[PDB]
Write a protein that binds this ligand. Structure first.
Ligand SMILES: [Mg+2]
Ligand SMILES: [Mg+2]
Ligand SMILES: [Mg+2]
Ligand SMILES: [Mg+2]
Ligand SMILES: [Mg+2]
Ligand SMILES: [Mg+2]
Lengths: 51, 149, 77, 117, 190
RNA sequence: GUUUAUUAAAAACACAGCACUGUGCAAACACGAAAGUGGACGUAUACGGUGUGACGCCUGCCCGGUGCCGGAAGGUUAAU
RNA sequence: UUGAGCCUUGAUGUGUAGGAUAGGUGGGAGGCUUUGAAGUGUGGACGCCAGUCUGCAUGGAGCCGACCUUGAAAUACCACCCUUUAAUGUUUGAUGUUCUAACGUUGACCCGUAAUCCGGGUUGCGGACAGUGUCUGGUGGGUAGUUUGACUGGGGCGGUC
């Protein structure tokens, strides 16, 4: 979220953004509410993540 | 109206001028708290008698609170009978009611608090000097000579 | 009643002439106003129901003379 | 008029467009530029390139207080989110610290429904 | 000043480069911008011209000495017609027009004369004195004025050059005289 | 309940209920050239005006016209 | 000190044959800058981000004109300045800020007074506002006064004058 990155380097170096926000919770909340269907959605994040 | 003022009065007045003021200001503020008055003509010459008198007359009378000192340098020497210790150093000493009382008591009539002997005021014999006061700007010098008799 | 204690101005009647010259009876009231006046010669406030013209008369003659008229005709103030 | 040197480049990157605002530390708006403000409309503006040329335009506008080193605050998804800070680096800028400020409700307001497309 | 401080030119080299650039009204209705015939200006000034008139094969031995330096010929009506870098002025009148020798297609040169008895008449001075000044863009009067050789002596124009105040438009205020060039700038009033 | 006292008692008026809309109180409003007074010894859960008329189920589309409400840049525009 | 009158101290312009972003005509065949320049480099900045400018500066010693085209020729110099803006004014109101002392108080108190009137006084709150007079535009069936034709195979409609 925050990067001090002092002296030598003009490369951004903010890969921290691909560690939380962005399409993280932001693609999430962007649209269709959901409500109970995430239940089903996450029941594939595990029916998969079993193996 | 015109109205002629009394006291100094801020961003317009003077002390006895003939300004011109909005009537709302004249009634309601100025004249009631007598800081001015209707220029009823009757008045504007009530003021012309007051344009000759005190000014033209009593400033050549302060030309007498001034020419008192035309008789401050035309003598320019009073002596005080005050002696001397162990070498011509005053056995006496003379101040303001000594240099105003030993000034008055002749043809040189001054008001006792009109004699500035800055201190020396005073501590030895012989000739000295002093600052004689009659007007605010015109004083005058003399010479004083404490005579050891 | 709408009367200027200085000048005696009171309502008068006249006409409202329309564009077509139709007359309708009307009035003209005077610019009356109750106004406190500092009488120096009395260490007191005398308030007079006066017309604006009234005031100007008081400004010129001077409240002393003016009241001195009301007084001289028992117009009590 | 006036002068700064130590500043902040705020960016509002959002699918449809990205907007660059450059203000001092005490965020009092020193200059701005939008993807639409420059050209491109429709797809066009909702692109990293279009956001570059706005990041650019914004310089020739705040350089008018000779800014030297400035932080960057990045809000929203969408292009121009990073491509903007590149056009900023180059523009002629010591670019101090970078932060992301996209808001995250702790699940509050129900967001819009649909997009049966 | 009341008139003008004609001592308003105390460095170029010869400050005669001055002009008559006064002010006139507007066109709220119908008025125009014109000049008479060679406005001479009550002042010898000191101008020798090369006045170009369109006489014929007789007016070359006396229609050329009267404040000028030549006159277009008869063979040179269109035998001076073969170039743009090769070629006051004139155009005689009565019943004679000259669009066959000044017409279509960017210069002004109208006043020369019209005589049925002479080429240099017994009393005909006034031509080679001062220029013209028709319509421009935001007013009129452009031309020339006094010189570095005068004093308040070129202010003979001041009472008979600013006095050229002919009927002003309508909704206007025509009145303001000015000149100068090659040192500073200015004018007084009207 | 009311009403055409004396040719009409009614489906007309009122009505509880509803809706609009005005009103910060020296209220709006109303009787008064005015002072004064009702509104009210009340104060927006109050007071006025207008419509509709228990209740049940309900009360859609139109703001071009006419009224009203808001607007401020232009235009036009009084005495002066 | 904000919106208008207007006046000194200054800007400014991609119609073709082209060294190249020609305002219309006018003085015009040499002014000047060492009272210290052309443009490199950033400062305010008008913005059709096509380019222009200078208080300042790194700078440090010439550029050009009828030249051959174009219905119109010099960024060689000067101005009366239009396409439209921008920086003090002058006063004048003007929107504005306070003040209090006119004026309002249907706050509190005091006295005339064993009085919810009124008058005077003291205070608090307002305040040159509000309100009223005169003039003035608008609105104004609330009120008022009237008008709203005649011929006609009755009158009206139609028609006619
Ligand atoms: Mg009956
Ligand atoms: Mg019956
Ligand atoms: Mg009600
Ligand atoms: Mg009904
Ligand atoms: Mg009627
Ligand atoms: Mg009939």
């Amino acid at each position: 979220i925050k990067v001090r990155e002092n002296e030598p380097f003009d490369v951004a170096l903010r890969r921290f953004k691909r560690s939380c926000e962005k399409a993280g919770v932001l693609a999430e909340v962007r649209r269709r509410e959901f409500y109970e269907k995430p239940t089903t959605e996450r029941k594939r994040a595990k029916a998969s993540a079993v193996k | 109206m015109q109205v002629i003022l009394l006291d100094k009065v801020a961003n317009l007045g003077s002390l006895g001028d003939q300004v011109n003021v909005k009537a709302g200001y004249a009634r309601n503020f100025l004249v009631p708290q007598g800081k001015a008055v209707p220029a009823t003509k009757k008045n504007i010459e009530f003021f012309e008698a007051r344009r000759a008198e005190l000014e033209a007359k009593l400033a050549e009378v302060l030309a007498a609170a001034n020419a008192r000192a035309e008789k401050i340098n035309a003598l320019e020497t009073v002596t005080i009978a005050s002696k001397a210790g162990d070498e011509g150093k005053l056995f006496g000493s003379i101040g303001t009611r000594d240099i105003a009382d030993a000034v008055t008591a002749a043809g040189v009539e001054v008001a006792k608090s009109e004699v500035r002997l800055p201190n020396g005021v005073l501590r030895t014999t012989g000739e000295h000097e002093v600052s004689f006061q009659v007007h605010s700007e015109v004083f005058a010098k003399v010479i004083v000579n404490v005579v050891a008799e | 009643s709408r009367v200027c204690q200085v000048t005696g101005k009171r309502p008068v009647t006249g006409n409202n002439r329309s564009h077509a010259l139709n007359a309708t009876k009307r009035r003209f009231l005077p610019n009356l106003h109750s106004h406190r006046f500092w009488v120096e010669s009395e260490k007191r406030f005398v308030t007079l129901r006066v017309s604006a013209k009234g005031m100007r008369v008081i400004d010129k003659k001077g409240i002393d003379t003016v009241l001195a008229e009301l007084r001289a005709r028992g117009e009590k103030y | 008029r006036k002068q700064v040197s130590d500043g902040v480049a705020h960016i509002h990157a959002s699918f449809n467009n990205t907007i660059v605002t450059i203000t001092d530390r005490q965020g009092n708006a020193l200059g701005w530029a939008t993807a639409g403000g420059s050209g491109f409309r429709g797809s066009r503006k909702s692109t990293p390139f279009a956001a570059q040329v706005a990041a650019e335009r914004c310089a020739d506008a705040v350089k008018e207080y000779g800014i030297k080193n400035l932080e960057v605050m990045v809000k929203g998804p969408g292009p121009g989110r990073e491509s903007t800070i590149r056009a900023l680096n180059a523009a002629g800028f010591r670019i101090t610290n970078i932060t992301d400020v996209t808001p995250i409700p702790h699940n509050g307001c129900r967001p819009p429904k649909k997009r049966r497309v | 000043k009341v008139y003008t401080i004609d001592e308003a030119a105390r460095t170029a080299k010869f400050d005669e480069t001055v002009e008559v650039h006064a002010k006139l009204g507007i066109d709220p209705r119908r008025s125009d911008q014109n000049v008479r015939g060679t406005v001479s200006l009550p002042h010898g000034l000191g101008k020798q011209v090369r006045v170009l008139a369109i006489a014929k094969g007789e007016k070359i031995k006396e229609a050329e000495e009267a404040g000028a330096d030549y006159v277009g010929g008869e063979e040179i009506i269109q035998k001076i017609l073969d170039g743009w870098m090769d070629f006051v002025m004139g155009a005689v009148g009565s019943k004679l027009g000259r669009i066959l020798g000044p017409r279509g297609l960017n210069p002004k040169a109208g006043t020369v004369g019209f005589n049925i008895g002479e080429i240099i008449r017994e009393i005909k001075a006034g031509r080679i004195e001062f220029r013209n000044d028709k319509t421009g863009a935001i007013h009129a009067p452009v031309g020339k004025a006094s010189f570095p050789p005068e004093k308040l002596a070129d202010n003979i124009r001041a009472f008979i050059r600013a006095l050229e105040a002919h009927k002003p438009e309508g909704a206007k205020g025509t009145f303001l005289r000015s000149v100068y060039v090659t040192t500073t700038m200015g004018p007084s009033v009207r």
